[PDB]
C-alpha cells in the first residue's frame, strides 16, 4: 500500500507520501501524486481501496472548498477533520461504503499545527505523527525512538529520510520516488522528493 | 388582466411576468463589467449604508469560483441564493468533470436555475440579473449577463441595475480597442463610467478587479481614490 | 390588485406580500440589541404584562440556540416558535457535521435562506418574524445581525424593530459612540432608548427584558438579568435623568 | 379589508392573519371556561351544558386526562378538541417513550402548540377552532398554559375562556389571591364559572377537574355535588 | 358574511362555519325522521319506511343497517353518503376487533366515525357526509347505549333522540315524556317511539311504513322487527 | 348560482346541486326498462339511432357488467361506459378474491359507492349516466338494481331510467311482474318501450332487448334474435 | 432468565428471576424483568433484554392511549392482539419472550407469547433459559382454584427451582401478583442467595496510585 | 470480533455523594495502537459525564450524535439533563438501529441535578438500560474489570476512596488486557468541585 | 414459487385432423406421497381451446382463476373475438417469462392445445417459459417415456384418428404407470373438435 506518514512540528506539519501508483503487478505511474489540497493551509492524504480514495477526496476537497468561498473565510483543520470524518461514519453503514484510509494536515492561525489519523472505519484521531498502509508497523516505530516535541524543519526532513531509507531497505517492492510538503504560516510548499542508485 | 399568472400568455404573444421581474432588477444598485485583454473588471455602487451598520455583509460582488466572479442587482434575498446555488454548481462540476467551470457553463446554469423558477406557477421568477465574468477560458476573459428572464448575453461591457441605460450609453461611445489597451485604462473605464451614475465621493464604488490565473482583488477605497484622482487629473488636462 | 399570493410580482417590480409582511413587522413589541466593545446586549419589551400572566420561561422575546449564540423575536408567536426551532436544529447540526460552534452570520444566512424559500414557493406566507442575532466567533467575535421576513440580513451595532422602531434606531444612531461603548454603557444606552421607545413611563423592570453576552475565560457565558439588576439599572437611569434635568 | 378575509396564507396590508382572528373568534363564542393555578394544585373548570335533558351528561367529557398528571379543559368547537386531545395524548407518549420519564406540561403544551400551528400555514385546512387550557404539576410546581390556535402559548396563572370570558377574567383579579389552596381555588373556580353561568348549577351540568401533585382527576358527580352545596 | 359560505374550511366572521351548518340541513332533504329511545334493558329505534312507488323492492329499501351482531344503527339523510358512512362504520369495527378483539363499544364506533366527518370538515377535501348516524348496542357495564353522531363531528350519550325533518319536534316530545320516570320496558319502549313518531308526523302509522329495530340486554343481538311484531306492538299502543 | 359550480359545495338549504345536474342529464337521454320476471330479469333500452350511417349495433346501451350480470346504462354513453368497466372490474376481483359469482347486492352496493365517491370531490363531477343493474340465480332469485348519480341503489320489481320514465312506470305497474316468466314479459317489454316513443320527436330508433333468468340458465345474453322479432311482431301488434 | 405466571382462583400471579447476563458473565443479580404494561396488567421479559424492555414499553404506552380513550380499565386480550402483531410484522426478528397477564371485566387471564409471533392461553404458563424447570413444578404442585397465598409460594418454589437448577437465572426474585383489588409488586419477595462477607480489608488508602498530570475545575 | 477491532474499556464508579468515571487512553487498530490520546469519555453536563467502549467510529458517532439531540433537550428543557432521562435518551439513540446495531457500549456515571444522588448507568448495543449501584463495567476487556470491582468495591465509599479503588481497579484491569491500556485519565465528581487525574498506568 | 410443494405427473396430448386430444394424472404428489387423487389437471379455457399443465397445482390453479377471469372477459365485450390456442399460447410464455425475470416463476409446466379455424394448435410453455408447437407433447416424464412414443407414430405416419389417437395416449400413459413412481391410474382424456372441446374419465389400466 502507500505511505502515509506525518510530523508535528512545533510550528509547522510535515506529510510526505510516495509517488508510485501500480495496479497488482507493477508501478502504472512514477510521478502520481496522492496528497490533495483541501485548501490553502490545510491538506489530505487518502489512500485504501482504488477507485474510492480518488474521488472521496476530491468529494472532500469540493466541500472544503465550496466552504471556503460560500463564507470567505477557510474551514479550520480541525473543523475539516471533522467533515471528512463525518461523511465517513455517514457512507460507512449506507450500501457505497468508502473503504479509504486517510491522512489529513493542515495549519491553523489561531490554534496551530495539526495531524489527524484517519481510519478506514472514519475513526478521527489528533497524533503527532502517524503512518498508514501496511508500512505503518515499519517506521511507526522509527518516529516513536526518535521523535522530539520540538523537531526543527531541518531535522524532521532527515527523519523521513531515514523513514523513507528504512523503508526502501525492508520494503518488498519499489518506491522510487516520494511526495513531501510542508504546511506553515505563509502556506504549503512543495520540497524535493528523494532517490537512491543501486548500480 | 394577463399579468397575474406566469404561464399566461398576453394576446401579443408577452409572458408578462417576467417582464414584471425584470423591473425588480431595474430597481438595484448599478454593476458595470467591461473585459479587458489581461483583466475583467466588475463596477458596483455602494448605497452609502447606515451610519450604524456593518457593510461586511452587504457583500455584492461575490465569486462563484476560484476565478468566476458575478455582481448582481435585484432583490438581495434571491441574489444569494442564485449565488449559493451557482458556487454548489461550479464544485460539482468540478467534481464530475476536474477541468474548471467555465464562465460559460455557470452562466447557463444560472440562466436555467432561472428558467426552471420562471416556467410554472408556485415558483417566482428570480429578479436578479447577474454580470459573471471570468478568465475560466484559459486564456480567454469572458463576460456575460444573465437576465431575471432566464437568457444569457456575451457582452465586451454592460450594465444592470439602476442607471443601466446611461451608463450603456456611456460605455458604447468609450469602450474601444484602444481604451482597454491596459490594465490601468480598463479600470479607468470603469470608474469613468460608474462615475455619471454614482455621483458621490469615494467608498460609493467597489470595484473588483482580476487577472489573468489570479484571484479576485476587491480594491481597497485608496486605491479607487488613487484611480479617481487619475482621473481627475486627466480631466484637469482636457480643459 | 397584485398581492393575491406572494409569488405575484407588481408592474413596478416589488413582492407585495414581502413588503406587507416587513410593515407588519411593526406590530410586534420593541426590541434592540447595542454591540460593545467586550459584547452585545439584548432589549425587549413585554407588551403583555396583566397579573394574572404568570412568568414561567422569562425569555419569551429572548431565545437560546446554542452555547455562543442568542436571538431575540419581534413577529407573529408561531412562525417565531417556528423560526427559533429552526434555528436550534441548523446550529445543532451544524456543530454535529463540523464540531464547532456556527460562526453566527452561518447560523443568519441559514434562516435567511429558509425564509427567502417561503416567499418564493408558492402556497406559502412570508414569515412575518424579525429577530435579532447576536453572538460570538473566531473568526469576527462579538456581532449582531437584523433578520427581515424576506430573508435580508445584515451586520448592525445596534437596532430596534417593533414598535416605534424608527425612533429607537434613529436616536441609537444619535448618540452611539462608536467602538467607545462597554457593557455597563451599553446597558445604560438600551434602558435610556427603550425609556422612550415605549409609551410606558417609568420603565418598569417587569415589563423590560435584557439579555447580555459577554466573553469570560473563553465560555461566552449567556446571562438574563435578573429582576433585581433591571431595577437598579431603572434606578440609576432615573438618577441620571434628575442629574440632567438639574443643569434646568 | 375585506379582500383578505379569505385566506389564511396572505397577509394583510396591515399585517393581520385575519383567518386566525377568525377562529380566535369563534374560540371565544364557545362554551365557558375557567382554571385558577393554587400554590397546592391546579384547578380546571368548564359548564356542561346540554341542549335538553335527553343528552346523557355523563357520555361526553369536557375535561380529559392527557397523561397520569397533564389535563385539559376547551372553549370552542369540541369535534376539533377531540383530535387536538388525540394529539396531545400521542405527544405525550412519544415524550415518555423517548425519555422515560412523564412529558412536562411546557414541554406537552409547547407541542400542542406546535401541532395547533401546523394547520395555520396551508390554504385548505381550516386553523383549529378550540384553544386548550392545559393544567400540569411536574417538578413540584402546579402549571397552566392556553394554547390557542394562532399556535401561542402561555402561561395563565387563572383566567377564563368562551363565552364571557370578560367577565370572568373581570371576576378574577378580585377573588384570586396568590397563596391560595386547592379548596379555596376549587371555590373560587366553581364562583367564576357562576358569574358566566346561565341556568341552575347542577351535578351534571358543571365539569371539573383537580390535578394536584396527586395527578389529574376529573371529580365524579358526588364531590361536584358536594363542592357545590358547600358554595351554595 | 354570506360570502364566506363557499368553501369549508374558511371561517364565518362571526366565528361559525357555514358548510357544516349547510351539510346538518342537508340532513333534511331525505324527507324522513328516525328517533331512538334508549329503556331500562333495551334500545329501540323507528324510522320511516316510504315507498312512493309500486315498483319498488320494499325490502331493498330498509334504512336500519346491522353495523354488527351487537350494534346497530339508522341512517337518516341523503341516501348515498348515508350508506358511505355505513360501509365505513362496518371498516371500523371490523379494524377494531382485529387489533384489539373485543367488540368495538357504540360509542367509540361512531367516535371515530365522527373523527372521520371532522378530518373531513378540516382538510377541504370532500363534502361533509350529510347523514346523521344513531347508533344503539347493549355494552356490558353500561346498560343499552344509543349514540347520535353527525356530520360536523359531534357524539353525546342520548336517553333518546331523533334525527331528520322532524327532529325539533320529535326531541320535544321526548322531553315531555322522559321526565315521568317510570318502567322504561321493552314494550314500553317500543310504544313510546312509535307513538313519539306518530304523533310527530300525525300519521296512522300503517305496519308497512315504519321499521324498526331493538337490541336488548337479555338478546344482545340487532333485531329488526318484521311485520307481525309491529302490529302486534301497535295494537297493543293502541289499546 | 354561486353554490352550484363544484360538486362538494353543499347548498344554502342542503343539496349537492351538481349531483341534481346529473340527474337532470340522465333524464335528457333515451328510456330504458328493467323488468323482472317471476323467473329472471329483462332489460330493454330505446337505442336511438342519430344517424343512417350507424352498424345497427353501434353504441349499444346493454352492457355484460358480468356472466350473469347485465347492465342497461342510459344517458351520457362515455360514463356508461366508463361505469360497465369499473363493474367489470369489481366483479373480477370479487370473483378472483372470493372464488364466487360477485351477488348483483354486493356489486351494486360497490358501484354505487364508486359512482357516489365521484361526487363528492370538486376535483371530479359526478357521473351523467344511470344504469339499472340485473342478474338471475337459484341461490338467490333475480335481482334488479338501479343506481342513479346521486349513488343511491335499492332494489326494483321494474324500473325505468331516462326521457319517459314516469310514462314507461305508468304502464310498468299494470303489469304483473310477480307471477309471468321471462317469455311473455318480453314481449311485454317490447311492446311499453314501443308505447314510450315520441316518434315525432325522434327520429327512429333500434330496438334492444336482454334478459337473465331460468330461461338463460342464469347467464345474461343478448335475446335471441328469432325470439327478439317476436316480441317486436307484438309491439307492431300494439297500436302504439 | 425463567418467567412464570399461574392464574389462581381470584386472578394471575407473575414472577421472574433478576440475571440478566451478556455472553457468559450475569450484567448484575437485580435487574427487573417484570415489565409494567398497565395498572392491570403486567409482563415478564425473557430473552433479548432490551428488545423486551422497548417492546414493553411500546406495547404498555400503545395500551395507554387506547385506555385513556375508554375510560375503562384495558382488557388482557387487547394487551395481546396488539403485542401479537406486533412481534409478527417482524417475523420474529425480535428476540423477545414474554407472557401476558392480568384481569378484567371477563375475569383474570393469563396469556404467553413466543418470540416468534405465537401465543396461546394457557393456565399456568413460563418462558425464557429455564422455562423447562418453571413447567416442571407447575405439573407436580399446581391445581385449579389455587388460593392467594399458597399461590405465590408455588411460583416463587418455580422460580427458585430454576434458580438452583439453571444457570441463567437467580441472584434475586420477584413477583407480581395481579388481583381485581390488588397490584402488588414484590421487588423483591427473597432473596435466593446473597454474596459471601468480605473476610480481607484490601487497603484502599490514599497515595497508592500515581497520576501523570493533574486539572481540577471549579463548579457553581 | 466486532468489539475487538479497536479495544478499549471505560469505567464508571460511585460513593457518598461522589461519582467515578475511569477509562482507557489507547487508541489503535485491532493490532496496531495508533495514538494514546483517544478520549472515550465525553460529558453531557456539568456533572454528568458518559464513556463509550468498541469500535472508536460507533463511539465517536455516539458521542457526537448524542451531544446533538442534548443540546436540543437542554435548550428546550431550559434544564440540565437528569441523569436517568440521559440514560433513556441514549437507550432509544441506540435501539433506533436494532437491525443496523451500533458497535458501542456506553456508560453513564454523574449525580442527580436536584438532590446530588449518584447514578451510573450502563446500555446494551442493542439499547438496555443498565442501572446498579455498586459499579459499571464496559469496554473490551470487561472481565478484568468486573472481576476486580467484585473485590474491591465498598460502600459508602469517601470522595478520595472513590478515585484509589477505582483508580487500581481499572489500571489493575488494563495490565490485564493487550488491546486496551496505554494510559488512562480518571475523572472524580463532587457537587463542589470536579478532579481529573491520569494515573501511572502501564505504558506496555 | 421457489420450491414445489404439490406436483404433478406428465402430461400428454396429439394432434389429429379434425382436432386435438390432451390427457393428465389425478394424483397430486406432495412430495413423494399422493397428497390428493381427485384433482382435474385439465380444464378448458373457451369452446375452441383447452390447456392442463404439471408442476404446482397451486400455482397452476392460479393460473385457472388468471385464465377463467382473463378467457371470461373475452366474451363479456360480445365482439365476437375469442382468444385463438396460439392467442392463449402467445399470453402464456410472456405471462411466465416476465414471471421468471423476477425470480418467481411459475413452477408449473402448462400444455395448451385447440382446434382454430380447421388447424390444429398444440403448444407447451414450460416452467421457465420455453414454448414450442409440436403434433404431439408430454410434460415432465412424458418427454422422456412417452414423447419417444409420438414421434414414430407420426414419423410413419402423421396422420391418426380420435380412436388411434385415444389409445396411443393409452399406450403412452399405460407405459408412464409402470415406469413411473408418481404416476397414478385415474386420468382425463381433453378432445377438441369442431362441435367443442368436452372432458371425460377417469380411466385405468391392466
Given at each position: 500500500?502507500?505511505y ?32 490533495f489540497?483541501?485548501?490553502?493551509k ?23 472548498q ?11 483543520p ?15 453503514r449506507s ?15 489561531h ?33 516513536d ?48 522528493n ?6 | 388582466?394577463?399579468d ?102 455557470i ?14 406557477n ?32 456575451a ?36 470608474i ?11 467608498k ?36 | ?8 410580482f407588481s ?18 413589541g ?8 467586550d ?42 416558535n417556528?423560526l ?20 453566527c ?65 434613529s ?50 457565558v ?21 442629574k ?5 | ?18 383567518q ?21 394544585g391546579?384547578?380546571?373548570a ?10 346523557d ?29 388525540h ?11 423517548v ?17 395547533m ?12 377552532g378550540?384553544?386548550?387550557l392545559?393544567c400540569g ?27 364571557n ?26 364562583l ?9 348549577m ?18 365524579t ?12 | 358574511?354570506?360570502?364566506?359560505d ?25 324527507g ?23 315498483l ?8 336500519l ?19 358511505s358512512?355505513?360501509?365505513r ?7 377494531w ?15 371515530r ?18 347523514c ?29 333522540t ?25 314494550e ?52 | ?15 349537492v ?6 340527474m ?17 330479469v ?44 369499473i ?8 370473483r ?61 320489481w ?71 322479432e317476436?316480441?317486436?311482431?307484438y ?6 | ?27 448484575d443479580k ?38 385513556l ?35 378484567d ?79 402488588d ?9 446473597k454474596?459471601?462477607t ?17 486539572k ?5 | ?41 465525553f460529558?453531557?453536563?456539568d ?17 457526537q ?19 436517568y ?22 456508560v ?85 468541585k470536579?478532579?481529573?487525574r ?7 | 414459487?421457489q ?25 397430486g ?65 410472456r ?10 416463476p ?5 400444455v ?14 414450460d ?5 414450442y408447437?409440436?403434433?404431439?407433447l ?13 414421434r ?55
Open positions: 500500500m502507500e502515509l506518514i506525518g510530523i508535528q512540528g512545533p510550528d509547522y506539519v510535515l506529510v510526505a507520501s510516495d509517488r508510485v501508483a501500480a495496479s497488482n503487478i507493477v508501478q502504472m505511474k512514477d510521478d502520481h501524486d496522492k496528497m489540497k483541501m485548501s490553502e490545510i491538506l489530505l492524504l487518502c489512500v485504501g481501496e482504488a477507485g474510492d480514495t480518488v474521488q472521496f477526496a476530491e468529494y472532500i476537497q469540493k466541500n472544503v465550496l466552504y471556503k468561498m460560500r463564507n470567505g473565510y477557510e474551514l479550520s480541525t473543523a475539516a477533520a471533522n467533515f471528512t470524518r463525518r461523511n465517513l461514519a455517514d457512507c460507512l450500501r457505497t461504503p468508502y473503504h479509504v484510509n486517510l491522512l489529513l494536515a493542515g495549519y491553523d492561525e490554534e496551530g499545527p495539526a495531524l489527524y489519523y484517519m481510519d478506514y472505519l472514519a475513526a478521527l484521531a489528533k497524533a503527532p505523527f502517524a503512518a498508514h498502509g501496511y508500512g505503518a508497523f515499519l517506521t511507526l516505530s522509527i518516529l525512538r526518535y521523535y522530539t516535541p520540538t523537531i526543527s524543519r531541518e531535522r524532521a526532513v532527515e527523519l523521513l529520510r531515514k523513514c523513507l531509507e528504512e523503508l526502501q531497505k525492508r520494503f518488498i517492492l519499489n518506491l522510487p520516488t516520494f511526495s513531501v510538503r510542508i504546511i506553515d504560516k505563509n502556506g504549503i510548499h512543495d520540497l524535493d528523494i532517490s537512491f542508485p543501486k548500480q | 388582466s394577463y397575474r399568472a406566469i404561464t399566461v400568455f398576453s394576446p401579443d404573444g408577452h409572458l408578462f411576468q417576467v417582464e414584471y421581474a425584470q423591473e425588480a432588477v431595474k430597481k438595484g444598485s448599478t454593476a458595470v463589467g467591461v473585459r479587458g485583454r489581461d483583466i475583467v473588471v466588475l463596477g458596483v455602487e455602494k448605497k452609502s449604508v447606515a451610519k450604524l451598520q456593518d457593510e461586511r455583509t452587504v457583500r455584492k460582488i461575490c465569486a462563484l469560483d476560484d476565478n468566476v466572479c458575478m455582481a448582481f442587482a435585484g432583490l438581495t434575498a434571491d441574489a444569494r441564493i442564485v449565488i449559493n446555488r451557482a458556487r454548489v454548481e461550479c464544485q460539482s462540476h468540478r467534481l464530475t468533470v476536474e477541468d474548471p467551470v467555465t464562465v460559460e457553463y452562466t447557463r446554469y444560472i440562466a436555467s436555475l432561472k428558467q426552471r423558477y420562471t416556467q410554472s408556485g415558483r417566482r421568477p428570480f429578479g436578479i440579473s447577474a454580470l459573471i465574468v471570468g478568465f475560466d477560458f484559459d486564456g480567454t476573459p469572458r463576460l456575460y449577463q444573465t437576465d431575471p428572464s432566464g437568457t444569457y448575453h457582452w465586451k461591457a454592460n450594465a444592470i441595475g439602476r442607471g443601466a441605460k446611461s451608463v450603456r450609453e456611456f460605455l458604447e461611445k468609450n469602450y474601444t480597442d484602444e481604451a482597454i489597451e491596459t490594465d490601468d485604462l480598463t479600470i479607468k473605464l470603469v469613468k463610467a460608474l462615475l455619471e451614475v454614482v455621483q458621490s465621493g469615494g460609493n464604488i467597489e470595484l473588483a478587479v482580476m487577472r489573468r490565473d489570479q484571484s479576485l482583488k476587491i480594491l481597497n477605497p485608496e486605491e479607487i481614490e488613487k484611480y479617481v484622482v487619475e482621473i481627475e487629473k486627466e480631466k484637469e488636462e482636457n480643459e | 390588485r397584485y398581492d393575491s399570493r406572494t409569488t405575484i408592474p413596478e417590480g416589488r413582492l407585495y406580500q414581502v413588503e406587507y409582511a416587513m410593515e407588519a413587522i411593526g406590530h410586534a420593541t426590541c434592540l440589541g447595542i454591540l460593545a466593545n459584547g452585545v446586549l439584548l432589549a425587549a419589551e413585554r407588551r403583555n404584562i396583566h397579573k394574572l400572566l404568570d412568568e414561567v420561561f422569562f425569555s419569551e422575546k429572548i431565545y437560546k440556540l446554542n452555547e455562543d449564540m442568542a436571538c431575540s423575536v419581534a413577529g407573529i408567536t408561531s412562525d417565531a417556528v427559533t426551532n429552526e434555528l436550534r436544529l441548523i446550529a445543532q447540526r451544524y456543530l454535529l457535521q463540523y464540531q464547532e460552534p456556527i460562526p452570520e452561518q447560523l443568519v444566512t441559514a434562516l435567511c435562506d429558509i425564509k427567502q424559500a417561503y416567499t418564493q414557493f408558492g402556497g406559502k406566507r412570508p414569515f412575518g418574524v424579525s429577530l435579532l442575532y447576536i453572538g460570538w466567533d473566531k473568526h469576527y467575535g462579538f456581532q449582531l445581525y437584523q433578520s427581515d421576513p424576506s430573508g435580508n440580513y445584515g451586520g448592525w451595532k445596534a437596532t430596534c424593530i417593533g414598535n416605534n422602531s424608527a425612533a429607537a434606531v436616536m441609537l444612531k444619535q448618540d452611539y459612540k462608536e467602538g467607545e461603548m462597554t457593557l455597563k454603557s451599553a446597558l445604560a444606552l438600551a434602558i435610556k432608548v427603550l425609556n422612550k421607545t415605549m409609551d410606558v413611563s417609568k420603565l418598569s423592570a417587569e415589563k423590560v427584558e435584557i439579555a447580555t453576552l459577554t466573553r469570560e475565560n473563553g465560555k461566552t449567556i446571562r438574563v438579568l435578573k429582576q433585581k439588576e433591571v431595577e437598579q439599572l431603572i434606578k440609576k437611569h432615573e438618577e441620571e435623568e434628575a440632567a434635568e438639574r443643569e434646568k | 379589508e375585506r379582500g383578505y378575509s379569505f385566506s389564511l396564507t396572505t397577509f394583510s396590508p396591515s399585517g393581520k392573519l385575519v386566525i382572528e377568525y377562529a380566535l373568534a369563534a374560540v371565544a363564542g364557545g362554551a365557558p371556561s375557567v382554571g385558577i393555578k393554587a400554590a397546592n391546579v384547578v380546571l368548564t359548564e356542561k351544558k346540554q341542549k335538553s335533558i335527553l343528552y351528561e355523563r357520555s361526553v367529557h369536557k375535561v380529559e386526562p392527557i397523561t397520569k398528571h397533564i389535563g385539559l379543559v376547551y372553549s370552542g368547537m369540541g369535534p376539533d378538541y377531540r383530535v387536538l386531545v394529539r396531545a395524548r400521542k405527544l405525550a407518549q412519544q415524550y415518555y417513550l425519555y422515560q420519564e412523564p412529558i412536562p406540561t411546557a414541554q406537552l403544551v409547547q407541542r400542542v402548540a406546535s401541532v400551528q401546523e394547520y395555520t400555514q396551508s390554504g385548505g385546512v381550516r386553523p383549529f378550540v384553544s386548550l392545559i404539576w411536574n417538578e413540584g410546581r402546579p402549571y397552566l398554559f392556553q394554547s390557542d390556535p394562532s399556535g401561542a402559548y402561555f402561561a395563565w396563572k387563572a383566567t377564563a375562556m368562551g363565552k370570558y370578560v367577565n370572568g377574567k373581570t371576576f378574577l383579579e378580585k377573588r384570586y389571591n396568590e397563596d391560595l389552596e386547592l379548596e379555596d381555588a376549587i371555590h373560587t373556580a366553581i367564576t364559572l357562576k358569574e358566566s353561568f346561565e341556568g341552575q347542577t351535578e351534571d351540568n358543571i365539569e371539573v377537574g383537580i390535578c394536584n401533585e396527586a395527578g389529574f382527576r376529573r371529580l358527580p358526588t364531590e361536584v355535588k358536594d363542592y357545590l352545596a358547600a358554595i351554595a | 358574511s354570506a360570502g364566506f363557499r368553501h369549508i374550511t374558511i371561517f364565518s366572521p362571526e366565528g361559525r362555519l357555514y358548510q357544516v351548518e349547510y351539510a346538518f340541513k342537508a340532513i333534511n332533504q331525505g324522513l325522521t328516525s328517533v331512538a329511545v334508549r329503556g331500562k334493558d333495551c334500545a329501540v329505534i323507528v324510522t320511516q319506511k316510504k315507498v312512493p312507488d309500486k319498488l323492492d320494499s325490502s331493498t329499501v330498509t334504512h343497517f346491522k353495523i354488527t351482531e351487537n350494534i346497530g344503527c339508522v341512517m337518516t339523510g341523503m341516501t348515498a353518503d348515508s350508506r358512512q355505513v360501509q362504520a362496518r371498516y371500523e369495527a371490523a379494524n376487533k382485529y387489533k384489539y378483539g373485543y367488540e368495538i363499544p357504540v360509542d367509540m364506533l361512531c367516535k366515525i365522527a373523527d372521520i366527518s371532522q378530518v373531513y370538515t378540516q382538510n377541504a377535501e370532500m363534502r361533509p357526509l350529510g346523521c348516524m344513531i347508533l344503539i348496542g347493549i355494552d356490558e357495564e353500561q346498560g343499552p347505549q344509543v349514540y347520535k353522531c353527525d356530520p360536523a363531528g359531534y357524539y353525546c350519550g342520548f336517553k333518546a331523533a334525527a331528520g325533518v322532524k327532529q325539533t319536534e320529535s326531541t320535544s316530545f321526548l322531553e315531555k315524556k322522559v321526565k315521568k320516570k317510570f318502567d322504561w320496558t321493552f314500553q319502549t317500543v310504544e313510546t317511539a312509535i307513538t313519539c313518531l306518530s304523533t310527530v308526523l300525525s300519521i296512522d302509522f300503517k305496519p308497512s311504513e315504519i321499521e324498526v329495530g331493538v337490541v336488548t340486554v337479555e338478546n344482545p343481538k340487532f333485531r329488526i322487527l318484521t311485520e307481525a311484531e309491529i302490529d302486534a306492538h301497535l295494537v297493543a299502543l293502541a289499546e | 348560482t354561486g353554490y352550484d359550480l363544484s360538486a362538494s359545495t353543499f347548498s344554502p338549504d342542503g343539496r346541486f351538481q349531483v341534481e345536474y346529473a337532470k342529464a340522465v333524464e335528457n337521454s333515451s328510456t330504458a326498462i328493467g323488468i323482472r320476471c317471476k323467473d329472471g329483462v332489460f330493454g333500452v330505446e337505442k336511438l339511432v342519430l344517424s343512417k350511417l350507424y352498424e345497427e349495433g353501434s353504441n349499444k346501451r346493454l352492457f355484460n357488467v358480468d356472466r350473469h350480470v347485465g347492465m342497461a346504462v342510459a344517458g351520457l354513453l362515455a360514463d356508461a361506459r366508463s361505469l360497465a368497466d363493474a367489470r372490474e369489481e366483479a373480477s376481483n370479487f378472483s378474491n372470493f372464488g364466487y359469482n360477485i351477488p348483483l347486492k354486493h356489486l351494486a352496493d360497490r358501484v354505487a359507492m364508486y359512482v357516489h365517491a365521484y361526487t363528492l370531490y370538486s376535483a371530479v363531477r359526478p357521473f351523467g349516466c344511470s344504469f339499472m343493474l340485473g342478474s338471475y340465480s337459484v341461490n338467490d332469485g333475480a335481482q334488479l338494481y338501479m343506481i342513479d348519480p346521486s349513488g343511491v341503489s335499492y332494489g326494483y321494474g324500473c325505468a331510467i331516462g326521457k319517459a320514465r314516469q310514462a314507461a312506470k305508468t304502464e310498468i305497474e299494470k303489469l304483473q311482474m310477480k307471477e309471468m316468466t321471462c317469455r311473455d314479459i318480453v314481449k311485454e317489454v317490447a311492446k311499453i318501450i314501443y308505447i314510450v316513443h315520441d316518434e315525432v320527436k325522434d327520429k327512429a330508433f333500434e330496438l334492444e332487448l336482454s334478459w337473465v333468468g331460468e330461461l338463460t340458465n342464469g347467464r345474461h345474453e343478448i335475446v335471441p334474435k328469432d325470439i327478439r317476436e316480441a317486436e311482431k309491439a307492431k301488434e300494439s297500436l302504439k | 432468565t425463567t418467567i412464570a405466571g399461574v392464574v389462581y382462583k381470584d386472578g394471575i400471579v407473575l414472577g421472574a428471576d433478576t440475571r440478566a447476563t451478556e455472553g457468559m458473565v450475569v450484567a437485580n435487574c427487573s424483568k417484570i415489565h409494567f404494561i398497565s395498572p392491570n396488567i403486567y409482563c415478564c421479559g425473557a430473552g433479548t433484554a432490551a428488545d423486551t424492555d422497548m417492546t414493553t414499553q411500546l406495547i404498555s404506552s400503545n395500551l395507554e392511549l387506547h385506555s380513550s375508554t375510560g375503562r380499565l384495558p382488557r388482557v386480550v387487547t394487551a395481546n392482539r396488539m403485542l401479537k402483531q406486533m412481534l409478527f410484522r417482524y417475523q420474529g426478528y425480535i428476540g423477545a419472550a414474554l407472557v401476558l397477564g392480568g384481569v371485566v371477563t375475569g383474570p387471564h393469563l396469556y404467553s407469547i413466543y418470540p416468534h409471533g405465537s401465543t396461546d392461553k394457557l393456565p399456568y404458563v413460563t418462558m425464557g433459559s429455564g422455562s423447562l424447570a418453571a413447567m416442571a413444578v407447575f405439573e407436580d404442585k399446581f391445581r385449579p382454584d389455587m388460593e392467594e397465598e399458597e399461590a405465590k409460594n408455588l411460583v416463587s418454589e418455580a422460580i427458585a427451582a430454576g434458580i438452583f437448577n439453571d444457570l441463567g437465572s437467580g441472584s434475586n426474585i420477584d413477583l407480581c401478583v395481579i388481583s381485581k383489588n390488588k397490584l409488586f414484590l421487588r423483591p419477595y427473597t432473596v435466593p442467595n454474596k459471601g468480605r473476610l480481607g480489608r484490601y487497603r484502599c488508602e490514599k497515595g497508592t496510585t500515581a497520576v501523570l498530570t493533574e481540577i475545575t471549579p463548579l457553581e | 470480533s466486532i468489539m475487538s477491532y479497536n479495544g478499549g474499556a471505560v469505567m464508571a464508579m460511585k460513593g457518598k455523594n461522589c461519582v467515578a468515571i475511569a477509562a482507557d487512553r489507547r487508541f489503535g487498530i485491532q493490532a496496531q495502537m495508533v495514538t494514546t490520546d483517544f478520549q472515550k469519555i460529558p453531557m453536563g456533572r454528568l459525564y458518559i464513556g463509550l467502549a468498541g469500535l472508536a467510529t460507533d463511539v465517536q458517532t455516539v458521542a450524535r448524542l451531544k446533538f439531540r442534548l443540546n436540543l433537550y437542554e435548550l428546550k428543557e431550559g434544564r440540565q439533563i437528569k441523569p432521562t440521559l440514560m433513556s435518551m441514549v437507550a432509544n439513540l441506540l435501539y433506533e438501529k436494532r437491525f443496523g446495531p451500533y458497535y458501542t457500549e456506553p453513564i456515571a454523574g449525580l442527580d441535578p436536584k438532590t446530588f444522588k449518584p447514578f451510573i448507568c450502563s446500555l446494551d448495543l442493542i439499547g438496555c438500560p443498565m442501572v446498579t449501584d455498586d459499579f459499571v463495567v464496559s469496554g473490551t476487556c470487561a472481565e478484568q474489570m468486573y472481576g476486580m470491582c467484585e473485590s474491591l468495591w465498598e460502600p459508602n465509599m469517601d470522595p478520595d476512596h472513590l478515585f484509589e479503588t477505582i483508580s487500581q481497579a481499572m489500571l489493575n484491569a488494563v495490565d490485564r488486557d493487550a488491546v486496551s491500556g496505554m494510559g488512562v485519565i480518571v475523572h472524580i465528581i463532587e457537587k463542589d470536579i478532579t481529573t491520569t494515573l501511572k498506568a502501564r505504558m506496555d | 414459487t420450491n414445489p410443494m404439490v406436483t404433478g405427473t406428465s402430461v400428454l396430448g396429439v394432434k389429429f385432423e379434425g382436432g386435438v386430444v390432451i390427457a393428465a394424472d389425478m394424483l404428489s406432495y412430495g413423494s406421497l399422493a397428497r390428493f387423487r381427485n384433482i382435474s389437471r385439465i380444464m378448458r379455457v373457451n369452446n375452441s381451446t383447452m390447456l392442463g399443465a404439471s408442476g404446482d397445482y397451486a400455482d397452476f390453479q392460479y393460473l385457472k382463476q388468471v385464465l377463467g377471469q382473463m378467457v371470461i372477459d373475452e366474451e363479456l365485450l360480445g365482439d365476437g373475438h375469442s382468444y385463438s390456442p396460439r392467442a392463449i399460447h402467445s399470453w402464456l410464455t405471462a411466465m417469462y416476465s414471471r421468471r425475470s423476477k425470480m418467481n411459475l413452477w408449473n409446466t402448462m395448451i392445445g385447440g382446434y382454430a379455424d380447421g388447424e390444429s394448435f398444440l403448444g407447451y410453455v416452467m421457465l417459459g420455453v414454448a408447437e409440436a403434433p404431439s408430454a410434460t415432465g416424464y412424458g418427454a422422456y417415456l412417452a414423447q419417444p412414443l409420438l414414430e407414430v407420426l414419423e410413419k405416419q402423421p396422420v391418426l384418428s380420435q380412436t388411434e389417437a385415444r389409445d396411443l395416449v393409452e399406450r403412452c400413459m399405460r407405459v408412464l404407470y409402470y415406469r413411473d413412481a408418481r404416476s397414478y391410474n385415474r386420468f382425463q382424456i381433453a378432445t377438441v373438435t369442431e362441435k367443442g372441446v368436452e372432458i371425460e374419465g377417469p380411466l385405468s389400466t391392466e
